[PDB]
């Protein structure tokens, strides 16, 4: 017995070094990871997350974003139109305009709209006819561009680390005024300069600026009372930057050799 159970003990010895029976983990899409990261940043600042239509009216895609029927933006050549008036959305701003109007002219508004967007273009390693945006929109009563700047700083840190700085360059979009194009300090080279940032030490990640008076007013808000800031970014681009992904199409091709690299948590590192 202290013979027999003792030599059962020994017939039962194992190499504990051998492969476990895997209990496999599926992957979260890199594009979803970036969106949720950004969801989490803004939930924590009191914002809501809004979804809208992927097929949209040209009033909300365009007219309500300060693109009158003339405007070159609305070329049938560069957007996927379905009729004269209906098309695949080109950005997530229609959702934000539809949302504002519903609020009949009372703030705050503070929303973040991620989603799929669509552009009439030929596909290669840096161009996709379907890709993703996140926009947001804050409308309140003494909203300043200093306030858009602090918000962008948090976004940039969220995405690329606590040490990031930003740079704001003047620019122009019809729906905002003033407008900015936004760079993040390069997360690879401190600020020496590198391939990643085209040896400038700055990488462009966002555009933004103050919501344009006409945009507020077409939606019912009073531009003498309320200001506004908004911004867009592209997870496809962010995640190709962050990881060195070589081909935008890799997001929509679902090679498991691509997808399955994105199982694990990440941190602020050191």
């Amino acid at each position: 017995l202290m013979e027999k159970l003792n030599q059962q003990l020994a017939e039962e010895t194992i190499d504990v070094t051998l492969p476990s029976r895997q209990i496999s983990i599926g992957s979260k899409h890199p594009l979803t990871r970036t969106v949720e990261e950004i969801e989490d940043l803004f939930l924590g600042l009191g914002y809501e997350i809004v979804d809208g239509y992927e097929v949209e009216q040209d009033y909300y895609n365009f007219e309500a974003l300060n693109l009158p029927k003339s405007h070159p933006a609305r070329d049938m050549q560069d957007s996927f139109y379905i009729t004269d008036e209906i098309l695949m959305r080109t950005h997530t701003s229609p959702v934000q305009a539809r949302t504002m109007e519903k609020r009949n002219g009372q703030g705050p508004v503070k929303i973040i709209c991620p989603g799929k967007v669509y552009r009439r273009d030929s596909d290669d390693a840096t161009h996709s006819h379907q890709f993703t945006q996140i926009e947001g929109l804050v409308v309140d009563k003494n909203i300043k561009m200093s306030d858009l700047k602090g918000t962008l700083e948090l976004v940039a840190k969220k995405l690329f680390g606590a040490d990031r700085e930003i740079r704001l360059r003047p620019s122009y979009f019809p729906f905002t005024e003033p407008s900015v194009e936004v760079d993040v300090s390069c997360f690879k080279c401190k600020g020496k300069g590198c391939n990643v940032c085209k040896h400038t030490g700055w990488i462009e990640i966002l555009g933004a600026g103050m919501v344009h008076p006409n945009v507020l007013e077409m939606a019912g808000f009073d531009s003498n009372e309320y200001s506004g800031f908004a911004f867009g970014m592209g997870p496809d681009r962010i995640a190709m930057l962050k990881y060195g992904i070589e081909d935008i199409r890799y997001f929509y091709t679902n090679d498991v050799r691509f997808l399955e690299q994105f199982k694990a948590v990440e941190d602020r590192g050191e």
Partner: protein, 790 residues
């Protein structure tokens, strides 16, 4: 605290029934936990006068009940006699316990009703005076026959029980409560008479008081009243004591209980002609002094105890119990009355040590209003005059200073409004403090509130804020949310986030989250611990099951699996993330280290109808631990091992960065068997170690546009060597282009075959057959030289 409605109406009238009184008191701060009705379940109870008694062979009584003719009542009670005013339940009458009073005949003789004990109208024996305890009640003085008995008895009454907070010692008394009610109902309160017809002598010539421990006795006074005659208290004293859960004893003893209840001031009475001296001395006990309490138990004192003495000798434990000779007795005729303030902590500890907690001592514990110390002595002196034939000597002998009986506190209405969220004017705020009976003057925009010492809870002006809010009403306080001016996004820390994610992945794999007890039996506290290290025991465990902190999660997870299995729950899968505790030696906080462990037994996968049954084994258990490492992006290694409760040939140590951080293994077949368990596996890991690895961002590798190369090698080894050692050199030799390896087969006399599949790939540069053969063959050479055939 028990407040009689009846009684309270001597000091204040709210103009309202007792239920509405209770409700408004509750709403504004003092919880009325319940209401005791002394009229309940009683009908037709009247006073009788017993005119005559015959006992030629029961007690047959002729009783005047305020009708035309006397009624005969047979009463078997040993103390009933002619001359006595008594309580009669008339025919037609009801008493508690569903008792019915019927026309009747006892031993052939009419009884028209019943003469009652206090118990028989619902009074507890506990508080029935000794005189009437084992027969019937007899009124201490004359009352008109036919009168409503409960009314005559002062028991046609309801009594509120307060369940008070420590805040509100003031409502430990009738006088405190009447001040509260008078505020609530904005009506006048009246204190009772305390002016006595004083004699020509002074207590100054009767008595000295000296205090030796003034740190511990802020005040001590006495008065003297001479020529008391001891007899029953009047019925309103008796009944009020009773309603308040105190047994009446006699007029003098009862006065001191009564004025305790009335004013909140504990009073003590000494037989003046038995103090044994004409000096009272307060001081500490001496170490191992003795006294004998009224009680005839002998009390070993410590020096922390305050006693009363004369000069040689303790005549009492101050504030706690009288001694065995200075006390009032039936013979007493001259009395000294104490009104003293004793230190709350001193009294609390003495009474607790000696198990001599009283209603009076608890008043000292919860703190005494200075405003009423003399007035309440004066009240007991007045009552002793009135009800004890007492003769009240002029003056008071005292030692110490009571302060001012008001303390001014300044406040502004902005501070009130900004603290609460109100918009009240000075007027409305100033009126609230007055309502409460606080003299309040407005100079500019500053109120000075003159806070009387009978509210000893109120000392600072936040105290005064609560008054406003509770009086004006918490219902009226507006709902807002604070707007922070320094803006930060709320997020989980990295560690917090990883922990949510990790729990998710363990739940995703079939493991239930456990929470076990931190405290184990001292015997098991060191179970499964790998570093020797002191355990942490409680001074006073409630259970031997819960005596010592935990150096592992496994004892209680094993217990929990034992328990499930006994209940026929055979498939148990649990994990826990929890602290374990390791002594940093004496007087030092321990190291609290967060572990991750779990335990598994039963099937992992089952679908009976298909014949699917996958039983948990060791490699499933490793799979769990591998999956934790994968999700966290951590590299764990695994070498064979020997531990404690574990199967010694199915146990492994787990390492992260050359640190050992835990183990996995099957339970020892003995330990299994002790717990009635089948094949069972546990793992345990230092989550703190895990969480120190900063893993950064995921390292993406490019997708290859062309194929890699796969070769399967076959080895022969010391049957005896860890696969881990093969994998390690191979992977040490494969440079840039070894992508992955797999042991996909093993055989075992003396040597084992290991089949291993190598996967070469280069997502970066063009892979060539020449580099892959160069490297391959350098692999198989590193292998040969660290001791490997084929």
């Amino acid at each position: 605290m028990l407040i009689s409605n009846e009684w309270l109406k001597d000091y204040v009238d709210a103009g309202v029934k007792v239920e509405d009184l209770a409700e408004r008191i509750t709403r504004t701060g003092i919880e009325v936990d319940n209401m005791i009705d002394y009229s309940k379940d009683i009908k037709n109870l009247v006073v009788g006068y017993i005119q005559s008694k015959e006992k030629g062979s029961g007690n047959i009584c002729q009783v005047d009940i305020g009708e035309e003719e006397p009624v005969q009542i047979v009463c078997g009670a040993p103390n009933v006699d002619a001359g006595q005013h008594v309580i009669v339940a008339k025919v037609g009458g009801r008493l508690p316990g569903g008792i019915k009073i019927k026309r009747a005949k006892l031993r052939g003789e009419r009884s028209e009703g019943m003469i009652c004990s206090l118990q028989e109208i619902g009074i507890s024996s506990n508080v029935v005076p000794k005189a009437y305890e084992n027969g019937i009640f007899v009124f201490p003085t004359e009352v008109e026959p036919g009168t409503d008995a409960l009314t005559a008895l002062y028991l046609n009454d309801q009594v509120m029980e307060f369940d008070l907070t420590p805040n509100r010692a003031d409502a430990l008394s009738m006088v405190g409560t009447a001040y509260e009610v008078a505020a609530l109902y904005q009506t006048e309160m009246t204190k009772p008479e305390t002016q006595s017809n004083e004699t020509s002598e002074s207590a100054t010539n009767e008595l000295s008081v000296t205090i030796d421990n003034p740190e511990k006795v802020p005040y001590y006074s006495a008065r003297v009243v001479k020529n008391v005659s001891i007899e029953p208290s009047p019925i309103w004293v008796q009944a009020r004591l009773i309603k308040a859960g105190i047994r009446p004893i006699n007029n003098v003893v009862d006065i001191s209980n009564y004025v305790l209840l009335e004013y909140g001031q504990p009073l003590h009475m000494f037989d003046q002609d038995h103090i044994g001296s004409k000096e009272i001395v307060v001081r500490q006990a001496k170490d191992e002094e003795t006294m004998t309490t009224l009680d005839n138990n002998e009390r070993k004192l410590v020096d922390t105890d305050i006693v009363i003495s004369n000069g040689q000798e303790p005549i009492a434990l101050a504030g706690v119990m009288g001694g065995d000779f200075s006390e009032v007795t039936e013979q007493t005729t001259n009395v000294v009355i104490e009104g003293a303030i004793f230190d709350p902590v001193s009294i609390r500890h003495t009474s607790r040590r000696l198990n001599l907690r009283s209603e009076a001592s608890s008043r000292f514990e919860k703190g005494i209003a200075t405003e009423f110390v003399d007035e309440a002595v004066d009240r007991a002196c007045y009552l002793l005059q009135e009800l004890a034939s007492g003769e009240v000597l002029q003056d008071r002998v005292s030692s110490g200073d009571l302060g001012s009986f008001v303390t001014p506190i300044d406040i502004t209405a902005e501070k009130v409004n900004k603290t609460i969220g109100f918009n009240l004017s000075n007027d409305e705020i100033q009126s609230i403090f007055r309502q409460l009976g606080f003299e309040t003057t407005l100079k500019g925009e500053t109120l000075t509130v003159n806070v009387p010492s009978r509210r000893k809870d109120i000392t600072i002006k936040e105290d005064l804020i609560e008054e406003v809010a509770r009086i004006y009403g918490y219902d009226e306080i507006p709902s807002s949310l604070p707007v922070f001016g320094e803006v930060t996004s709320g997020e989980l820390t990295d560690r917090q986030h990883k922990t949510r994610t990790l729990k998710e992945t363990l739940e995703g794999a079939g493991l239930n989250q456990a929470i076990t007890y931190s405290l184990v039996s001292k015997d098991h506290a060191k179970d499964f611990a790998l570093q020797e290290r002191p355990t942490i025991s409680l001074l006073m465990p409630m259970s031997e099951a819960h005596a010592t902190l935990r150096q592992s999660l496994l004892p209680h997870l094993i217990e929990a699996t034992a328990y499930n299995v006994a209940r026929k729950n055979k498939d148990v899968r649990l994990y826990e993330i929890g602290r374990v505790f390791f002594g940093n030696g004496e007087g030092e906080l321990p190291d609290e280290v967060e572990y991750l462990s779990g335990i598994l037994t039963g099937e992992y996968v089952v679908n009976a109808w298909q014949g699917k049954k996958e039983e948990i084994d060791f490699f499933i258990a490793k799979g769990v631990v591998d999956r934790v490492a994968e999700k966290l992006n951590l590299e764990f290694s695994y070498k064979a091992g020997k531990i404690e409760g574990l199967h010694p040939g199915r146990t492994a140590i787990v390492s992260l960065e050359g640190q050992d951080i835990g183990f996995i293994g099957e339970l020892h077949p003995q330990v299994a068997a002790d717990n009635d368990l089948k094949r069972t596996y546990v793992f345990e890991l230092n989550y703190d170690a895990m969480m120190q690895v900063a893993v950064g961002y995921i390292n993406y590798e490019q997708i290859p546009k062309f194929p890699g190369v796969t070769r399967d090698i076959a080895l022969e080894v010391n049957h005896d060597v860890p696969s881990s050692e093969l994998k390690q050199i191979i992977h040490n030799n494969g440079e840039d282009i070894l992508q992955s390896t797999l042991v996909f087969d093993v055989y075992e006399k003396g040597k084992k075959s290991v089949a291993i599949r190598l996967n070469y790939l280069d997502t970066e540069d063009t892979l060539t057959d020449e580099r892959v053969s160069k490297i391959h063959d350098k692999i198989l050479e590193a292998l040969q030289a660290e001791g490997a055939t084929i």
